């Protein structure tokens, strides 16, 4: 006799009137005229915003820093809308529309002569930030099929996560730091200036603690 | 991409500045060598090719 188990009920979950992802424009409504510096620190280090679920239960977690341009948004919008079930699923954007101006000089120009004109706009994304959040009358296995497909097409490392998997991922990392048998840690050595190591480290390494290098995030570092 | 023609000292003898564009469906051939840079030639060669093929679609 096969042993059956109860199934969860989604009758208490409401679906918005616009389950599909909204269109995202290349540029804001009012174009920007003040050119901005490169400001590479906007994709460096852990994300301090959009790091928690709001309405949905499934999302794409960013495992590294990078810029999203209008090409990536169209890839995300078209794939998710096509592969989702509007009657039981809904998707929302956890990242803003492209707003950071990017300047490109004319092809073949030598160095100098000022700064190039604005070419396109990008959205800076740090590691650990949700990009697209989904939810509704569905399981994680149903949406994991195409969310991972979208995740691997992003300029940064990404992975489809849920409320349970993300909590498990964070709790597993906390367990790794707790039972770490290595007497020496990056945080201890860097903060104490042991061996004069800060002469080769960065001031950001006091808070990154060796888990971040440039735009890259290393989950195996404790 | 091929080397241009003209009295232009050493730059042509090594630099493939001239650009030839061939539209396979129509067979039109557009060549431009006015500018020293290939990219500058390529853009104008495209623009002439666009204009010539603009007439072809009108004729089409």
């Amino acid at each position: 006799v096969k042993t059956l188990l109860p199934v969860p009920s989604f009758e208490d979950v409401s679906i918005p009137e616009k389950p599909k992802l909204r269109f995202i424009e290349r540029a804001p409504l009012v174009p920007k005229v003040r050119r901005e510096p490169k400001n590479l620190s906007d994709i460096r280090g852990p994300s301090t915003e959009a790091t928690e679920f709001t309405e949905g239960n499934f999302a794409i977690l960013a495992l590294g820093g990078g810029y999203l341009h209008w090409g990536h948004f169209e890839m995300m919008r078209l794939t998710i809308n096509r592969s989702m079930d509007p009657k039981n699923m809904f998707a929302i954007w956890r990242v803003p529309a492209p707003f950071k101006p990017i300047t490109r000089k004319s092809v073949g120009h030598r160095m100098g002569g000022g700064k190039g004109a604005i070419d396109h706009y990008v959205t800076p994304v740090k590691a650990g930030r949700l990009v697209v959040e989904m939810g509704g009358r569905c399981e994680f296995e149903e949406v994991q099929g195409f969310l991972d497909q979208v995740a691997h097409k992003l300029p940064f490392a990404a992975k489809a996560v849920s409320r349970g998997t993300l909590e498990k991922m964070r709790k597993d990392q906390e367990e790794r730091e707790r039972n770490n048998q290595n007497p020496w840690t990056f945080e201890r050595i860097a903060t104490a200036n042991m061996l004069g190591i800060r002469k080769v480290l960065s001031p950001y390494d006091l808070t990154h603690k060796g888990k971040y290098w440039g735009k890259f995030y290393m989950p195996k570092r404790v | 991409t091929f080397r241009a023609k003209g009295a232009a000292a050493q730059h042509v003898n090594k630099t493939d500045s001239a650009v030839r564009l061939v539209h396979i469906p129509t067979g039109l051939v557009v060549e431009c060598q006015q500018e020293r840079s290939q990219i500058k030639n390529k853009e104008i060669a495209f623009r002439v090719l666009r204009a010539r093929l603009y007439q072809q679609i009108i004729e089409k």
Partner: peptide, 18 residues
């Protein structure tokens, strides 16, 4: 060799006031 543009920002060469 292409002729490039020019910077439109002038001034701003003041020294520090100490």
């Amino acid at each position: 060799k292409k002729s490039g543009g020019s910077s439109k920002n002038l001034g701003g060469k003041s020294s520090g006031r100490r």
